[PDB]
């Protein structure tokens, strides 16, 4: 799919009138398309409150774009980047305009992004200080004891706000298991989920 039609694309967007939800989920996007599409999430009537990007052939210098676009943006509220080899280093770019007060995504997945624990003090640091952040799935990545700690760290912030945490505990020592339990009753309305846990 050429760029003269993405280009295209995202101008129909903008004059298409209570367009709430965009799902490009299965469209390998260019970085032309990437462009285009961080300029029509920048006009400010942009009603977009959902944006799925899930398998799309993201890469990091995808998410610099896009974390750069939404900067003007308090009215998306879902963001879905699962399976795009995102990379520790596009989910750095994300969590610094997440980590804004002015920031308030709701609902954010990262399933199958390629993060490691490199990436969880910047996504602490979102949980930390997040105005609206309720659902975080991390599903599907390389996470060990070290990422998710610092996690924890995030997780036990009073302003952390989290209900729904995606997080598959499968290498995590028992020590781990057993922190991630013992937060189950610091924050009773925190619920950790795994769809690869039976
Ligand atoms: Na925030």
Redesign the pocket.
């Known amino acids: 799919v050429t760029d003269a039609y993405w280009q295209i694309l995202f101008s129909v967007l903008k004059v298409t009138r209570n367009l709430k939800e965009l799902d490009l989920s299965g469209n390998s996007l260019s970085h032309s398309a990437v462009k285009s599409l961080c300029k029509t999430l920048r006009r400010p009537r942009c009603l977009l409150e959902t944006l799925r990007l899930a398998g799309c052939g993201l890469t990091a210098e995808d998410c610099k774009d896009l974390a750069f676009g939404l900067r003007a943006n308090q009215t998306l509220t879902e963001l879905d980047l699962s399976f795009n080899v995102l990379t520790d280093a596009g989910a750095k770019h994300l969590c610094q305009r ?8 709701q609902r954010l997945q990262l399933v199958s992004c390629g993060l490691t624990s490199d990436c969880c003090q910047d996504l602490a640091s ?1 949980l930390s ?5 309720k659902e975080l799935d991390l599903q599907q990545n390389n996470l060990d004891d070290v990422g998710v700690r610092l996690l924890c760290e995030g997780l036990r912030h009073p302003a952390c706000k989290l209900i729904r945490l995606g997080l598959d505990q499968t290498t995590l020592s028992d020590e781990m298991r057993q922190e991630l339990r013992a937060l189950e009753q610091e924050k009773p309305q925190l619920l950790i989920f795994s769809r690869r846990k039976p």
């Open positions: 997440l980590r804004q007060p002015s920031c308030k995504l979102v200080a997040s105005p609206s952040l």
